[PDB]
Amino acid sequence: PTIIYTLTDEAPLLATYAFLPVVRKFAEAAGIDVKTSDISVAARILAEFGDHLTEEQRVPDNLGELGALTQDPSANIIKLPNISASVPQLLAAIKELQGKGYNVPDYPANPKTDDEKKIKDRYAKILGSAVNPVLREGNSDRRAPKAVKEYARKHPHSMGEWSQASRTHVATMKTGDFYHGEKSMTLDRDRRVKMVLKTKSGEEIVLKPEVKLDAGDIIDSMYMSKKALIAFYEEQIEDAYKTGVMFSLHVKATMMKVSHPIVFGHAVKVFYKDAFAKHEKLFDELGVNVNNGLSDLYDKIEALPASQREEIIEDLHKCHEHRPELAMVDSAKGISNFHSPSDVIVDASMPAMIRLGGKMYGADGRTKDTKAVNPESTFSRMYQEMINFCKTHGQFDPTTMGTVPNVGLMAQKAEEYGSHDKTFEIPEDGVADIVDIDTGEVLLTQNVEEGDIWRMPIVKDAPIRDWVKLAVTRARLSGMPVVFWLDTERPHEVELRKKVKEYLKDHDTEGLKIQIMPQVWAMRYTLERVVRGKDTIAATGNILRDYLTDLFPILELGTSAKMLSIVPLMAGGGLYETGAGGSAPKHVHQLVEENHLRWDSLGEFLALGASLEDMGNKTGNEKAKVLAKALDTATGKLLEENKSPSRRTGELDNRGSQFYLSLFWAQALAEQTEDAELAERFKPLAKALAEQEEAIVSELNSVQGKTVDIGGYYYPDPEKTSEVMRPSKTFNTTL
């Protein structure tokens, strides 16, 4: 009977320092041990580079440990939001660890000696989205809990009005992209395959030497034509200019770490083609990679002599005169859409733009309409339908609209999420085949060109079965109809359709509305329903799982940070994500400088409830059920009494809201009558907490408004942090 709580980075971790003690006190009453696990960026640096560390300094491979635990039918993991480290974040975490006596190697951006290549490659394991692929050995059940939905209706968030005369739209490719050249197939038997490029010269380049494929795996051979991509950009940049609408670009270079920077990069290239021509030679040897955005260019020209660097920036701002207006990320500082690929992230930016009435920010500071460019059509057409719907129906009404929960196929690096190590920028014109080693059979041929992006996504049979099961499970349990978003004109989704059609019959689907529709149809059908106050489950692939679980919750609730993210693992256990957003760097900024943490721990409370409830069902622990339901009613009272953390310094913060939760949790257990022992167990505690309420609250608020010492950033001192995060001694002694 063990719950694994994850120690992560920044704000969620700080909240954990105050919350971990109070969850431990409640969980022990059911015989559950709350065991910690450190997956912070620092702990992952240490675990990898234990080469020059003492025994006491060494840490286990906590990620690999948790990854292994997912195979255990009793796994119970609570995953808090964590950093997906960029280079600057990695460097800062390294530098802090070094200064604290941990002998870890520097990260060499450009490895001089060959020994530096090995440790740079070892750091590549730490960079980016590294935690999610390992923990996701199940499929996604993401939905807004009834109590949160009810709260959104009573307290509606602001939403920009949609004008019928709005000019904003999604711009996307009609040919030469992944979708319009896709070939797909379901595997007959186990095979081992290689990815080879037979050039026009006659040479055979092996891009990927070997990949093990199981029976029933779906594989795709999709590519994007570089020539088409640029001609598309030429066209759209021109169109946006001619029509006078603001140009914007929405990709996900954060997670799609290979393909999307190439997509991002090309936009910048063709947009500023006049400047990139004047300085081509200079840019080349400077090693400028604008795939990393303009920020890369600006870095590599900053060291240059003043008269030369100023000439460069002048050729860039001069290029704007024949160009369309650009969407800005920070219009005061002059930071635009093209500055960094990690600024405008498709899953978050598109909802934000729709939420605002189809608006993004201009160079003048004004909001205006935008051509929201999403080059890859596969998953972007669905956004356009909503824009169209809104244009005729107006902005959604949070007080009356329905819900769109999601059942997402993600398990075992599903589809595009596990295709990173299998994506390649093509070196020269040739034919790209995936060939079987045993029997030289080309499984899928594809004619590619120089620059083209080629990848082979993989989705295993077993995950698909669980995914369909979860769809029917959610349908039965909620009474909501469910729609599978599967295109008829996309090979990959016709392959999935064959499977869904079959595996549905393996389940009892007698009293359920379950159908299959292509993306755009499904979106329309879903929109036609939400607007009439009706609910619909979206059973979707991996990338759509990501998009829709940001999109709809932003519209329904105002945020994607207030919802359940349950991962039923295929081996029997459950993983429970508390948040889908970042670890809130700015929240830590406010905590260290003026002792106020505005992090909302609601997602943690909800996940813990879903953790404790599933503990009751799987093991038979009836005392877990009672704690879960009491936390369920404790969380609900937290919302209705309006005691979520304030953003203003000096008011009720994260620590303060943790008190009120634990109070209500204690009260809920004291005044219930389905377990006699637990009732009288919490009775004195509940009586205690309530009695010195405006004494504990008085302490937690008085200590605010000053600089505080946690002893670091990426590795804060457990002793100092705990003092700060538990500053109420009245509260602490009560347990």
274 binds, among Mn ion, a copy of itself, none (CB under 5 to 8 A by kind): none
User: Scanning the structure block, which residue is given the tokens 């693992």?
Assistant: 569
Nearer to Mn ion, 347 or 556 (CB): 347
Instruction: Decide: is 33 part of the binding site for a copy of itself (CB under 8 A).
Output: no
Least distance (Å) from a copy of itself to the CB of residue 507? 8
117 binds, among Mn ion, a copy of itself, none (CB under 5 to 8 A by kind): none
How many residues in total does the chain contain?
Answer: 735
Residues 398-437, mask of contacts with a copy of itself (x by CB under 8 A): ----------------------------------------
Task: Tell me the C-alpha distance between 140 and 543, whole Å.
Answer: 12
Name the strand (E) or helix (H) holding 114: helix 114-123
Q: Does the annotation list 537 as a binding residue?
A: no
Q: Does the annotation list 297 as a binding residue?
A: no
96 binds, among Mn ion, a copy of itself, none (CB under 5 to 8 A by kind): none
Instruction: Decide: is 174 part of the binding site for a copy of itself (CB under 8 A).
Output: no
CB 63 within 8 A of CB 130: yes
Applying CB under 8 A, which of residues 502, 528, 671, 693 lies at the interface with a copy of itself?
A: 502
Instruction: Decide: is 438 part of the binding site for a copy of itself (CB under 8 A).
Output: no
Task: Tell me the C-alpha distance between 200 and 195, whole Å.
Answer: 16
User: Scanning the structure block, which residue is given the tokens 């920028």?
Assistant: 425
Task: Tell me the C-alpha distance between 52 and 183, whole Å.
Answer: 49
Q: Which two tokens stand for residue 431?
A: 């034919």
Q: Does the annotation list 132 as a binding residue?
A: yes
Least distance (Å) from a copy of itself to the CB of residue 213? 17
Instruction: Decide: is 347 part of the binding site for Mn ion (CB under 5 A).
Output: yes
User: Scanning the structure block, which residue is given the tokens 């309409």?
Assistant: 369
Q: Which two tokens stand for residue 195?
A: 């990815």
Instruction: Decide: is 285 part of the binding site for a copy of itself (CB under 8 A).
Output: no
723: region left, alpha or beta (phi > 0 left; psi from -120 to 50 alpha)? alpha
Least distance (Å) from a copy of itself to the CB of residue 491? 11
**Of 456, 537, 468, 466, which Cα lies nearest the Cα of 498?**
468
505 binds, among Mn ion, a copy of itself, none (CB under 5 to 8 A by kind): a copy of itself
Q: Which amino acid would we find at residue 393?
A: H
Q: Does the annotation list 129 as a binding residue?
A: yes
Applying CB under 8 A, which of residues 146, 322, 501, 647 lies at the interface with a copy of itself?
A: 501
Applying CB under 8 A, which of residues 310, 506, 674, 709 lies at the interface with a copy of itself?
A: 506
Least distance (Å) from Mn ion to the CB of residue 563? 11
CB 485 within 8 A of CB 464: no
Q: Which residues contact 378 (CB under 8 A, 6 or more apart)?
A: 177, 178, 179, 490, 543
Nearer to a copy of itself, 151 or 503 (CB): 503
**Of 603, 545, 609, 551, which Cα lies nearest the Cα of 8?**
603
Name the strand (E) or helix (H) holding 199: strand 191-199
Instruction: Decide: is 214 part of the binding site for a copy of itself (CB under 8 A).
Output: no
The one segment of 25-33, 323-331, 396-404, 504-512 that binds a copy of itself by CB under 8 A: 504-512
Task: Tell me the C-alpha distance between 331 and 272, whole Å.
Answer: 19
Instruction: Decide: is 416 part of the binding site for Mn ion (CB under 5 A).
Output: no
550 binds, among Mn ion, a copy of itself, none (CB under 5 to 8 A by kind): Mn ion
Contacting Mn ion within 531-560 (CB under 5 A): 546, 550
Q: Are strands 430-436 and 191-199 parallel, antiparallel or unpaired?
A: antiparallel
**Of 449, 445, 444, which Cα lies nearest the Cα of 428?**
449
Nearer to a copy of itself, 176 or 408 (CB): 176
Q: Which two tokens stand for residue 617?
A: 């069902």
Buried b (16+ CB within 10 A) or exposed e, 496-512: bbebbeebbeebeeeeb
- Return the DSSP state at 272: T
Instruction: Decide: is 106 part of the binding site for a copy of itself (CB under 8 A).
Output: no
Binding residues for a copy of itself, total number by CB under 8 A:
5
CB 193 within 8 A of CB 443: yes
Instruction: Decide: is 505 part of the binding site for a copy of itself (CB under 8 A).
Output: yes
Contacting Mn ion within 559-618 (CB under 5 A): 580
Task: Tell me the C-alpha distance between 716 and 735, whole Å.
Answer: 25
Least distance (Å) from Mn ion to the CB of residue 550? 4
502 binds, among Mn ion, a copy of itself, none (CB under 5 to 8 A by kind): a copy of itself
**Residues of the shown chain interacting with Mn ion in the complex, contacts defined by CB under 5 A:** 347, 546, 550, 580
**Residues of the shown chain interacting with a copy of itself in the complex, contacts defined by CB under 8 A:** 501-502, 505-506, 508
